[PDB]
């Protein structure tokens, strides 16, 4: 993270969808960061857990991704991620990310789209 600029930082809880168990499973709580690589100007999401600082999200904010509402929440986004490396080997996930408030979720969407436009260049 030393080669990266911090574009946006917000406290969040991240879930991944378990298709087997038909339920949302928490993956981490802590600071969600949008990091711009000084070398490639590519913006990733990097999220670390409170206390342990373990990575629960590490993926490019792909221009192709779309934030959708969750039926249950006015302060969460659901999106498909095709390549997250938090736990090592690149894996596809259905993520949900929830914030402290609607304002935080709206602001996140704003930054996430700004990052998508940077990643398009």
């Amino acid at each position: 993270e030393e080669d990266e600029e911090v574009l946006y930082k917000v406290r969040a809880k991240l879930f991944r969808f378990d298709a087997d168990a038909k339920e949302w499973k928490e993956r981490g709580t802590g600071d969600c960061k949008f990091l711009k690589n000084k070398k490639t100007n590519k913006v990733r999401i990097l999220m670390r857990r409170d206390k342990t600082l373990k990575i629960c999200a590490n993926h490019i904010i792909a221009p192709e991704y779309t934030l959708k509402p969750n039926v249950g929440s006015d302060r969460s986004w659901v999106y498909a991620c095709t390549a997250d490396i938090a736990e090592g080997e690149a894996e596809a996930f259905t993520f949900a990310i929830r914030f402290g408030s609607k304002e935080n979720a709206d602001k996140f969407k704003e930054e996430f789209e700004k990052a998508q436009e940077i990643n398009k260049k």
Partner: protein, 995 residues
């Protein structure tokens, strides 16, 4: 292949067993797991014990031999008494033989302590069954075999330690009262000889490992042996000199001397007092000469965590605190023991500086004991002046936030005592610590916070004049610190600490109106400060000061034009403009506290009117437009505004209670109309969208309105003084608005809060609304029972609230249950027994209480058909259900109330308080008493449930239960004895005569 060992039609392949065991302990993932399942099934095979002798002889894997002994332990503890004597002697001999053989091989003795210790514990299980009655020469032969070899002697000390533990430390839950007494008396009768072996080894032994094992056994002996074995032998001298010098023995020796300090000892014996002083002197002299001097930095040593230093310093704290809590008076009057007394306390001051929360609490408990004694005991404080001065600094530097309730309380109490003992010293330390915040030398957020908490903690200890000078000095210094500091972060930390300190000195605020007014107005300024934490601390400080100084807001202060509560209410829109909803609610709550001080009804009602002006006008605007067009509730924004209006009403009702009535009266009719309108929308939304609707922000918001309305009504009725108005004005519209809506919603749309609200209604006015209580039962009983009777997990809040409601209805309006039709009364008994079977302590305990209360309610009716039918239909259902949860091992938490209920049921029959035969005619001779039939019924039920018990065991148990059914503690003893005997075969029936 691995599953080969589960095939008992074959002989066991020990090479295979050793593979399975290795792959379990040393293997990974898939294969570790499947080996695990195979070993479990092997071990649990009830013939597996037959294989143990073979495994112990021919296995090369000490882990296989460990699991073999586990299998043998299951046999020994559960089925031992079914074996012929020759077989029991066979097993005893092959265990002893294996132990001796492993001890006689030096390499095995060194490398296989796991298998040896497990073997020793297996031997102790055999002793619990066989000794002494069927093995009288066990202890003599052990004593004899101890001279044979140092390894056998060392291992014999491990056997004796485990025996002492099993008999004295862990017998209470694991044996009958009779069998525990038998083994305690047996060890007591042979201890003289055990002690002589122990003492000779400590006197003459040279093996460090042998000496340590001997001292480990002594630690266990000290739990029960008479003091004379310690005070009338050289053993005190050895423990407090020789064994404190060697680091190998020092840890265990300190733990022994701690237990020596707890021995029951004669109190009027000067020689014994001198011995108690001497071992303490010897111990502290060995510490100072062999480990560290009194001046040593234990904070530094502990932090460094070299070898066993942390455990040793923990044990030293335990030893000093234990000894001094009991004996420091021995050291206080003799001028020659003064240095010892103060050196021991100086070691404790050094231990108190260690950064280890749990060690700090241990030393703090002791300091609390000391300073409490110096506060009350004459001519003592002067001894400890330098110790107390040091302790003031330690406590102030270690002060925690009041959120840590137990530690803050302990620390405050110690500092308050210390402040009383020397107020000048306390002030000087706190003011000089403040100076080191101001000069930057010790400045940090943690350090100014810590000092603020310490300064706050001693409020009320100083004289009002000294406090006044002190508080002004502190406030001046913190104000200068704030100005000096640069950046919002720094300024906000000190500003929070100023408001914290001021909040803790209400005596000062009450004497200085001008200053109090200034503080409140500054808190209002802070309620516009968006810097994180500032608005919260402003609102928190506001309500705290109001709670303590409310009277000063309700009177007209000299040189003010009106009570300050009027000034607050007149500017409330502006004051609260930038606050979050929960902050607004706290603010309104604080205003309610002040208004409830006004005891003139007209003036109180006007202040309440004026406080509720903004929410009432927002409510009126919504009601006018919500009635003119019912769609506007669709607006998510309007739902949030309504929820916050109701929450504002709850907050003010919380602080005003009974005084809130006129405000509740103003909104009541339209509030219940809103409840019905919101209820329709929820029912409609669930129909249109599915059960998922109940997760949507919209429906959750609508349900918040319903929950907050129920909370407001519950809050008011819980505090109402005029119960006539509650019944005549509030109850009928409430029951009409909430009961049919609850009954007629799908389970996922029912609010548990309805049940909670109805519990308060029945609790407060149930006696006045018999028809209302029947309507409550009719609406909630069967539909709620059907939600919670499929499993123990679904609808957890409904489950808890349901049994709280049934409990209060059974207490206040039992007539409502008399009115149930038989089928519903049956469902009531079913629901109570269902509550019994919960692991959930809230439900379990309410279940058992309802059962006791119901039996008492039936008893009161006397000799009438309903009571006689009740007993004929349900007496044996309650007896058998209660026995089931008592004996199934899955409901241990409910033992006390299970025992109470069973005792009540048995005593009813013992006294002949049931008027009809409990038995069907022709079942027994027609003359037979219920006592005889109950005895027969219980004997048959326990025989069917526990077929391995003898007829004699059951008969002796039931005969004891009958005799003891007016003596709860003894009755419970007999129940616990039965719980032990059902877990094994061949339990002694004479155990139930224990007295």
């Amino acid at each position: 292949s691995m599953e080969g060992i589960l095939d008992f039609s074959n002989d066991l392949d020990i090479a295979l067993l050793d593979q399975v065991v290795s792959t379990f302990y040393q293997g990974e993932g898939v294969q570790q797991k499947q080996a695990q399942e195979i070993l479990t099934k092997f071990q649990d095979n009830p013939d597996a014990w037959e294989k143990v002798d073979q495994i112990l002889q021919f296995s090369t894997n000490p882990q296989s031999k460990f699991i073999a002994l586990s299998i043998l332990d299951k046999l020994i503890t559960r089925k031992w008494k079914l074996l012929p004597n020759d077989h029991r002697i066979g097993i005893r001999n092959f265990v002893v033989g294996m132990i001796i053989s492993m001890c006689q091989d030096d390499e095995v003795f060194k490398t296989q302590k796991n298998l040896i210790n497990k073997s020793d514990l297996t031997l102790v299980q055999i002793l619990k069954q066989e000794w002494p009655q069927n093995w009288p020469e066990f202890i003599p032969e052990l004593i004899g075999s101890s001279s044979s070899s140092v390894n056998v002697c060392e291992n014999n000390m491990i056997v004796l330690k485990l025996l002492s533990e099993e008999v004295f430390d862990f017998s209470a839950e694991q044996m009958t009262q009779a069998k525990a007494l038998h083994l305690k008396n047996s060890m007591s009768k042979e201890f003289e000889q055990i002690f002589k072996l122990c003492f000779q080894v400590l006197e003459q032994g040279s093996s460090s490992s042998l000496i340590v094992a001997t001292l480990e056994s002594l630690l266990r002996y000290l739990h029960w042996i008479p003091y004379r074995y310690i005070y009338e032998t050289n053993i005190l001298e050895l423990l407090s000199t020789k064994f404190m010098t060697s680091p190998d023995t020092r840890a265990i020796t300190l733990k022994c001397l701690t237990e020596v300090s707890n021995l029951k000892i004669p109190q009027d014996n000067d020689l014994i007092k001198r011995q108690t002083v001497l071992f303490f002197q010897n111990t502290l002299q060995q510490i100072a000469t062999s480990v560290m001097p009194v001046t040593a930095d234990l904070k530094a040593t502990y932090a460094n965590a070299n070898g066993n230093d942390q455990s040793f310093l923990q044990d030293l704290a335990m030893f000093l605190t234990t000894y001094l809590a009991r004996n420091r008076a021995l050291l206080e009057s003799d001028e020659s023991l003064r240095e010892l007394l103060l050196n021991a306390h100086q070691y404790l001051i050094q231990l108190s500086k260690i950064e280890e929360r749990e060690l700090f609490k241990t030393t703090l408990d002791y300091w609390h004991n000391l300073v409490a004694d110096l506060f009350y005991e004459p001519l003592k404080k002067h001894i400890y002046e330098e110790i107390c001065s040091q302790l003031r600094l330690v406590i102030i530097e270690n002060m925690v936030r009041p959120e840590e309730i137990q530690l803050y309380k302990s620390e405050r109490e110690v500092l308050v005592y210390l402040t009383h003992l020397n107020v000048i010293d306390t002030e000087e330390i706190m003011i000089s610590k403040l100076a080191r915040q101001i000069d930057g030398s010790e400045w940090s957020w943690h350090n100014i916070n810590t000092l603020s908490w310490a300064i706050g903690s001693i409020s009320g200890t100083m004289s009002e004049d000294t406090e006044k000078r002190f508080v002004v000095t502190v406030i001046k210094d913190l104000l200068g610190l704030t100005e000096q500091k640069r950046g919002k972060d720094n300024k906000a930390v000190v500003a929070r600490d100023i408001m914290y300190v001021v909040g803790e000195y209400p005596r000062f605020l009450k004497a200085h109106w001008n200053f109090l007014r200034t503080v409140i107005l500054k808190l209002f300024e802070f309620m516009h400060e968006t810097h994180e934490g500032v608005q919260d601390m402003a609102c928190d400080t506001f309500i705290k000061i109001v709670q303590k100084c409310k009277y000063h807001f309700v009177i007209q202060q000299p040189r003010e034009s009106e009570p300050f509560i009027q000034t607050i209410i007149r500017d409330i829109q502006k004051t609260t403009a930038d606050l979050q909803p929960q902050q607004v609610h706290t603010f309104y709550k604080a205003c309610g506290i002040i208004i409830s001080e006004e005891r003139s009804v007209a003036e109180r009602n006007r202040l309440l009117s004026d406080l509720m002006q903004l929410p009432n006008m927002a409510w009126d605007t919504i009601v006018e437009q919500s009635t003119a067009n019912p769609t506007l509730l669709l607006d998510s924004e309007t739902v949030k505004i309504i929820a916050n209006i109701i929450k504002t009403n709850v907050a003010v009702c919380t602080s005003m209670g009974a005084d809130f009535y006129p405000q509740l009266g103003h909104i009541y009719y339209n509030m219940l109309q809103l409840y019905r309108a919101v209820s329709s929308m929820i029912s409609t939304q669930v129909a249109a969208e599915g059960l998922i609707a109940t997760k949507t922000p919209k429906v959750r918001g609508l349900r918040t309105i319903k929950k907050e309305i129920l909370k407001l009504v519950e809050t008011y009725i819980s505090k109402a003084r005029n119960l006539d108005d509650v019944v005549k004005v509030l109850v009928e519209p409430l029951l009409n608005a909430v009961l049919e809506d609850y009954m007629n919603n799908v389970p996922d749309a029912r609010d548990a809060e309805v049940l909670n609200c109805m519990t308060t209604v029945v609790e407060k006015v149930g006696h006045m609304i018999p028809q209302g209580v029947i309507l409550i039962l009719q609406s909630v009983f069967e539909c709620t029972l059907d939600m919670i009777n499929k499993d123990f997990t679904e609808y957890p809040e409904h489950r808890v609230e349901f049994y709280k409601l049934l409990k209060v209805i059974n207490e206040k309006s039992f007539a409502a249950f008399l009115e149930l039709p038989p089928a519903a009364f049956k469902l009531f008994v079913d629901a109570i027994c269902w509550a019994f079977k919960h692991n959930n302590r809230d439900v379990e305990v309410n279940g058992l209480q309802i059962a006791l209360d119901l039996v008492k309610n039936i008893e009161r009716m006397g000799n009438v058909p309903f009571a006689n039918e009740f007993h004929k239909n349900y007496f044996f259902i309650f007896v058998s259900e209660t026995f089931f949860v008592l004996t199934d091992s899955d409901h241990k938490s409910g033992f006390s109330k299970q025992a109470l209920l069973l005792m009540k049921l048995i005593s009813l029959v013992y006294d002949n308080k049931i008027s009809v035969p409990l038995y069907q005619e022709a079942e027994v001779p027609q003359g037979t008493s219920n006592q005889v039939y109950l005895s027969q019924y219980l004997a048959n039920m326990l025989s069917n449930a526990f077929p391995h018990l003898t007829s004699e065991q059951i008969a002796s148990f039931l005969s004891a239960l009958t005799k003891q059914c007016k003596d709860l503690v003894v009755f419970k003893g007999t129940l616990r004895d039965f719980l032990v005997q059902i877990k094994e075969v061949g339990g002694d029936p004479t155990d139930y005569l224990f007295a």
